[PDB]
Amino acid sequence: IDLLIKLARTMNFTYEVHLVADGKFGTQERVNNSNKKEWNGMMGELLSG
Amino acid sequence: ILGLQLINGKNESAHISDAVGVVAQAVHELLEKENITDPPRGCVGNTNI
Amino acid sequence: NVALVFSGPAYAAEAARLGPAVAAAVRSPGLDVRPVALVLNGSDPRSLVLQLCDLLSGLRVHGVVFEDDSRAPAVAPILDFLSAQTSLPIVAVHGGAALVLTPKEKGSTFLQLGSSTEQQLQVIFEVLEEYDWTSFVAVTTRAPGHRAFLSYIEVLTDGSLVGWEHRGALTLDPGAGEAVLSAQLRSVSAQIRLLFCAREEAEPVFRAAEEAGLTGSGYVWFMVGPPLPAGLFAVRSAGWRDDLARRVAAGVAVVARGAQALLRDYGFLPELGHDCRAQNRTHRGESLHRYFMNITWDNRDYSFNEDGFLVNPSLVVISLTRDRTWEVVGSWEQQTLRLKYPLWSRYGRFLQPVDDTQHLT
Amino acid sequence: IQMALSVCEDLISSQVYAILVSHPPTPNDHFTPTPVSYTAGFYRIPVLGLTTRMSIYSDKSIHLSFLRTVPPYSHQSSVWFEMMRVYSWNHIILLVS
Structure with missing residues (x-):
C-alpha cells in the first residue's frame, strides 16, 4: 500500500x-x-472493468 | 447528427433497366451443350427438379 | 381433429390402416382424436396448400404430422412458412423434413424431430478414446453451416487429460478433377478423416478418394450430415428405429399434453385454423412456442428449444459393414455411453492394419 | 396466401426464368418477399428484388436463391469504419438493439 501512495503523489x-x-x-x-x-479472483476482476 | 443516407432510396427507374441487361446478357451465352429445357408446364402437381 | 398427411402414393395404402391404429394408441381424459390421412401426390406446393386448406377450413383440424418418402429436404421450408401463417402447431416426425432449419421466423410453430450436428459431434469423441483414436483430422466441404462445425472443434479439444491433435483443409472442388482433388489429399497427418459432405456430392467424393488408394478397412471416415470404401460411420437419429406406427403416434401424443398444458390453467380451444384466408388478420396469437419444454413420453424426454428442435435425443450411430450394409453399433440414450463391440483387441475390428509388421504384442 | 395462389399459375404460366419483387407501398413488416422466396426457390429458380434491405435474406441455408441488388441495412457499419479513421478515432461504443 505504501508504494501506491508514492506513485499517486507524483x-x-x-x-x-x-x-x-x-x-x-x-x-x-x-x-x-x-x-x-x-x-476468477483478482485477475478476473481486472478485465471486466 | 451524422447519419447515413441512400442515393436512390425508393427508386425503381435504374433497377428495372439494370435487371433486364444482366438476364439478357446471361441468356446470350446460355446456349450451350447443356440442357436448355424450360420449366415444367402446368400447375396441378409436380415433383421434377 | 388432427391431420395425418403423408407423402407419396406408396404411403397411401398404409395411411388408411394407420388411422384406427393410432386412434387407440394414446388416450387422455376429455380428449377425442380423429386421425385423417390424405392421398395427395406431388412434391410441389400446388396440392400441398389447396386441399390442405380444405382440411383447415372444412375439417377444422389442429396439429399436423408430416411424413415424407424422399430424402430431399426441399419440402421442409414449405411448411415453415405455412406454420407461421395461420399460427398452427406443425410437427414433422421424419422424412425429407428431418434436418434442422435455422434460423426460423418469429412465432413459428414448426417442430422438427431431428438431431443437429452439435449432438452428433459429441458422441464421436467418446468412441475415439474408447478405441484409442486420439489422432484425427477434420475437413469440410462448402456448406451453409461449415462455420459451426469448425468453430466447436477446438472447444472439446481444449480440455480432457489426453492430448488431442487436429488438422484439415478448408474446402474441396469436385469439378477441379480427381488428380487435383487427390493432389491436396496427400496432406495426411492422422489415421482418421472427418468430412462435412453433402448427399449430392457424397458419391463423387467417394470416387475422388478412390484415386487416393484409401478404400479398404485400413482407413476410416465419419459422415456428418443425414464402390463404397470400407470403414464408414453414420448417424441415424432413430431413423431406422421405433418403426413408423410408433413414430407417427408420438406426434399427436405431445400435442395432447400441449393441449392439456394450456387447458389446465384456462379453458380455451383455439380456432385460428378454422379459416385459411377468410380473415385479413393474423394479429390474434399468443403462446405460439410457449409449450413443449418438459414432455415425457415413451420413457424418453422430448424437450425442445426455441428454434423448435430436439435437445434431449436418443441418438444411434451406424457403422458400415463389409457386406455393404449398415447396422447400429453404438447406443446413446440420455447421455449413456454403454456402446457395443468392446474395445479389446485394439487396431483390429473397424480398422485393419496398413502394415502387419509394426503392430506387435 | 392471397398472392401465394398465383406463385406458379400466373408467374410461371409464361414460362419465365426469374421473378422480380419490390417492397410494397404499404410499410408493413416486409411480408411481400416470403412467398416468392419459398415457392420460386423451391423450383431452384433464382429471384431478384429491388428496394430490399433486410439481412434475413443473406445466407443460402434458408434462401439458396436470392440476389438483391440493394445491399441490406448491415452495410451502414462499413461506412463508419472509414469515416472515423479520418477523424482520428480508436475506441468505440455501439448502441445496437
Whole structure:
C-alpha cells in the first residue's frame, strides 16, 4: 500500500482501494463450459472493468 | 447528427433497366451443350427438379 | 381433429390402416382424436396448400404430422412458412423434413424431430478414446453451416487429460478433377478423416478418394450430415428405429399434453385454423412456442428449444459393414455411453492394419 | 396466401426464368418477399428484388436463391469504419438493439 501512495503523489491522480471478493489469485480453472472457462479472483476482476 | 443516407432510396427507374441487361446478357451465352429445357408446364402437381 | 398427411402414393395404402391404429394408441381424459390421412401426390406446393386448406377450413383440424418418402429436404421450408401463417402447431416426425432449419421466423410453430450436428459431434469423441483414436483430422466441404462445425472443434479439444491433435483443409472442388482433388489429399497427418459432405456430392467424393488408394478397412471416415470404401460411420437419429406406427403416434401424443398444458390453467380451444384466408388478420396469437419444454413420453424426454428442435435425443450411430450394409453399433440414450463391440483387441475390428509388421504384442 | 395462389399459375404460366419483387407501398413488416422466396426457390429458380434491405435474406441455408441488388441495412457499419479513421478515432461504443 505504501508504494501506491508514492506513485499517486507524483502522478496527479486519486484512488479508492477495495479488497477482492475471494482471496484467490487469478487462475484459469479450465472447465470448457464457457468456451474454455473464464478467469476468477483478482485477475478476473481486472478485465471486466 | 451524422447519419447515413441512400442515393436512390425508393427508386425503381435504374433497377428495372439494370435487371433486364444482366438476364439478357446471361441468356446470350446460355446456349450451350447443356440442357436448355424450360420449366415444367402446368400447375396441378409436380415433383421434377 | 388432427391431420395425418403423408407423402407419396406408396404411403397411401398404409395411411388408411394407420388411422384406427393410432386412434387407440394414446388416450387422455376429455380428449377425442380423429386421425385423417390424405392421398395427395406431388412434391410441389400446388396440392400441398389447396386441399390442405380444405382440411383447415372444412375439417377444422389442429396439429399436423408430416411424413415424407424422399430424402430431399426441399419440402421442409414449405411448411415453415405455412406454420407461421395461420399460427398452427406443425410437427414433422421424419422424412425429407428431418434436418434442422435455422434460423426460423418469429412465432413459428414448426417442430422438427431431428438431431443437429452439435449432438452428433459429441458422441464421436467418446468412441475415439474408447478405441484409442486420439489422432484425427477434420475437413469440410462448402456448406451453409461449415462455420459451426469448425468453430466447436477446438472447444472439446481444449480440455480432457489426453492430448488431442487436429488438422484439415478448408474446402474441396469436385469439378477441379480427381488428380487435383487427390493432389491436396496427400496432406495426411492422422489415421482418421472427418468430412462435412453433402448427399449430392457424397458419391463423387467417394470416387475422388478412390484415386487416393484409401478404400479398404485400413482407413476410416465419419459422415456428418443425414464402390463404397470400407470403414464408414453414420448417424441415424432413430431413423431406422421405433418403426413408423410408433413414430407417427408420438406426434399427436405431445400435442395432447400441449393441449392439456394450456387447458389446465384456462379453458380455451383455439380456432385460428378454422379459416385459411377468410380473415385479413393474423394479429390474434399468443403462446405460439410457449409449450413443449418438459414432455415425457415413451420413457424418453422430448424437450425442445426455441428454434423448435430436439435437445434431449436418443441418438444411434451406424457403422458400415463389409457386406455393404449398415447396422447400429453404438447406443446413446440420455447421455449413456454403454456402446457395443468392446474395445479389446485394439487396431483390429473397424480398422485393419496398413502394415502387419509394426503392430506387435 | 392471397398472392401465394398465383406463385406458379400466373408467374410461371409464361414460362419465365426469374421473378422480380419490390417492397410494397404499404410499410408493413416486409411480408411481400416470403412467398416468392419459398415457392420460386423451391423450383431452384433464382429471384431478384429491388428496394430490399433486410439481412434475413443473406445466407443460402434458408434462401439458396436470392440476389438483391440493394445491399441490406448491415452495410451502414462499413461506412463508419472509414469515416472515423479520418477523424482520428480508436475506441468505440455501439448502441445496437
